[PDB]
Amino acid sequence: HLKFMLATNICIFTIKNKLNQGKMCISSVTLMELIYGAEKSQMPERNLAVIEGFVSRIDVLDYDAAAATHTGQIRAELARQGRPVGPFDQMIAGHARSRGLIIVTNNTREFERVGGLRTEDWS
Amino acid sequence: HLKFMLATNICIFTIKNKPASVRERFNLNQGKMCISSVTLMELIYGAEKSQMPERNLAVIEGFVSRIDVLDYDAAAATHTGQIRAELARQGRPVGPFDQMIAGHARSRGLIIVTNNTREFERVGGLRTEDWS
Numbered sequence: 001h002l003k004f005m006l007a008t009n010i011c012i013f014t015i016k017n018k019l020n021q022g023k024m025c026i027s028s029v030t031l032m033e034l035i036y037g038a039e040k041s042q043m044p045e046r047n048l049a050v051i052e053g054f055v056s057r058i059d060v061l062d063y064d065a066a067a068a069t070h071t072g073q074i075r076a077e078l079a080r081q082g083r084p085v086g087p088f089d090q091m092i093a094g095h096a097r098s099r100g101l102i103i104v105t106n107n108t109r110e111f112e113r114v115g116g117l118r119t120e121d122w123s
Numbered sequence: 124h125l126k127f128m129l130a131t132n133i134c135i136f137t138i139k140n141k142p143a144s145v146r147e148r149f150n151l152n153q154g155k156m157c158i159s160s161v162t163l164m165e166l167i168y169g170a171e172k173s174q175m176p177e178r179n180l181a182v183i184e185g186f187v188s189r190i191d192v193l194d195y196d197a198a199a200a201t202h203t204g205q206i207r208a209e210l211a212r213q214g215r216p217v218g219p220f221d222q223m224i225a226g227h228a229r230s231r232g233l234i235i236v237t238n239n240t241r242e243f244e245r246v247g248g249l250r251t252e253d254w255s
Contacts, residue, residue: 032200065194
């Protein structure tokens, strides 16, 4: 039973070192960011290989109609507040909220603005 | 059955009947079109930020019921990451959401229908059409 959705930065911290098993997942949106980071890195093949290994340990959730609907709502509400958030961060927030998941992030201030969204900082 | 993935602006053009050539072609192709859930997100955002959220939301719901909504999955994400990295290398970036639609389409072997096409024409393995 899934309890957490790890933000992209948390995935990176976990990989680089420098917690729960079976209860964690990522949005497919975070996978996209991870792939982009590896491929643009100095060692793309090696870093891509690492990501396949990371992904095999957690669930990757498809970004579905529910995730999209929550995201659209969040984006409209944020715009009203003058509260900017990254486009992908907004999608991860919506996905998490759509799934009743805790979003784990080292940016608890950025995701704090999404109403109905619980956050933890494992940094 | 699915052959096209409609970009967000094309959906809007279809809904508004402006330019009316898009809806014309939309009707030619019933049963062969879909959208990414990413586009649904953009559509919902547009409704909810408007002055009449409930009415515009209903419009989106009515439109979407006529086409398939595909979930943005691991393959879509992976093609997107790669497309994004390649555009970056070439120094020709595109909007954050647009590239996700491009990646979703390529991951599914679909034609992406869009009023741009210059932004995506160079993407290998990705076919594009303009209904404007």
